[PDB]
Paper text:
The rhabdovirus matrix (M) protein is small (∼20–25 kDa) but plays a number of roles during the replication cycle of the virus. The M protein is an important structural component of rhabdovirus virions, forming a layer between the glycoprotein- (G-) containing outer membrane and the nucleocapsid core composed of the virus nucleoprotein (N), polymerase (L), phosphoprotein (P) and RNA genome. In addition to its structural roles, M has been implicated in controlling the balance between transcription and replication of the viral genome, in promoting budding, and in modulating host-cell transcription, -translation and -apoptosis. To further investigate the role of the N terminus and hydrophobic surface-exposed loop and to investigate the structural conservation of M across Rhabdoviridae, we solved the structures of full-length M from VSV serotype New Jersey (VSVNJ) and from the lyssavirus Lagos bat virus (LBV).
The structure of LBV M was solved by SeMet multi-wavelength anomalous dispersion phasing and refined to 2.75 Å resolution with residuals R/Rfree = 0.207/0.255. Residues 48–202 of LBV M form a globular domain with an overall fold that closely resembles those of VSVInd Mth and VSVNJ M, with 2.8 and 3.1 Å root-mean-squared deviation between 138 and 139 equivalent Cα positions, respectively, despite the aligned residues sharing less than 10% sequence identity. While the central α helix and back 5-stranded β sheet overlay very well, the loop between sheets β2 and β3 is much shorter in LBV M than in VSVNJ M and no stretch of helix is present between these sheets. Strikingly, in the structure of LBV M a stretch of peptide is again observed bound in a shallow hydrophobic groove formed by the β1–α1 and β2–β3 loops of the globular domain. W112 in the β2–β3 loop sits under residues 33–35, its indole nitrogen forming a hydrogen bond with the carbonyl oxygen of P34. Overall, these interactions bury 830 Å2 of surface area. The interaction with the most likely monomer, related by the crystallographic symmetry operator [1+x−y, 1−y, 1−z] (23 Å from E37 Cα to E48 Cα), generates linear polymers of non-covalently linked molecules in the crystal. The structure of LBV M therefore reveals both a novel 7th family of PRM-binding domain and defines the interaction of this domain with its cognate ligand. The polyproline-II helix conformation adopted by residues 32–36 of LBV M is entirely compatible with binding of this ‘late domain’ to the NEDD4 WW domain.
Author numbering: 30 to 37, 48 to 202
The structure:
């Protein structure tokens, strides 16, 4: 099955703490998650200059295996990642992210509530490129959310963020 039943030029190093709690009485599937996040561009309430970071994080966070905590499945990610932007996209100097938002999906019988918490502070710990050593789910999620990128000509494995 695919189902999860109820619990019963500009470069930045960001220390990142990511948490998504999914709330679903009837349980949920990856398919539903992909439908929800399809429209993240038009739901995200945070700092636009940082939506690139958030999408990346949301993708990695949801590509892990969660844990049951109360009436929620809980995905946690805690990494130090390096992001590179093209042109003039991305955060201004010394700018940081403290984002949280409830996204609630509701379609007839199916009902899923996503609680997203992403914090990102600039640290001096050399971090890892977000776009290497990910898994198919991470990629699949970045594709859904329409993650805008452009390829680095220097390094093959590198993607510049366009948002």
């Amino acid at each position: 099955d695919l189902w999860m039943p109820p619990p019963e030029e500009n470069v930045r190093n960001f220390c990142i703490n990511g948490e998504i709690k999914i709330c679903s009485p009837n349980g949920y599937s990856f398919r539903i998650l992909r439908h929800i996040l399809k429209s993240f561009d038009n739901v995200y309430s945070g700092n636009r200059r940082l939506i690139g970071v958030v999408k990346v994080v949301i993708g990695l966070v949801l590509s892990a295996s969660p844990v049951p905590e109360g009436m929620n499945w809980v995905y946690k990610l805690r990494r130090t990642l390096i992001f590179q932007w093209a042109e003039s996209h991305g955060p201004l100097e010394g700018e940081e992210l403290e984002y949280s938002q409830e996204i609630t999906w509701d379609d007839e019988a199916e009902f899923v509530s996503l609680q997203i918490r992403v914090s990102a502070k600039q640290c001096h710990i050399q971090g890892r490129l977000w776009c290497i050593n990910m898994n198919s789910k991470a990629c699949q999620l970045w594709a859904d959310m329409g993650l805008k990128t452009q390829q680095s000509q220097e390094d093959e494995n590198t993607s510049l963020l366009l948002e």
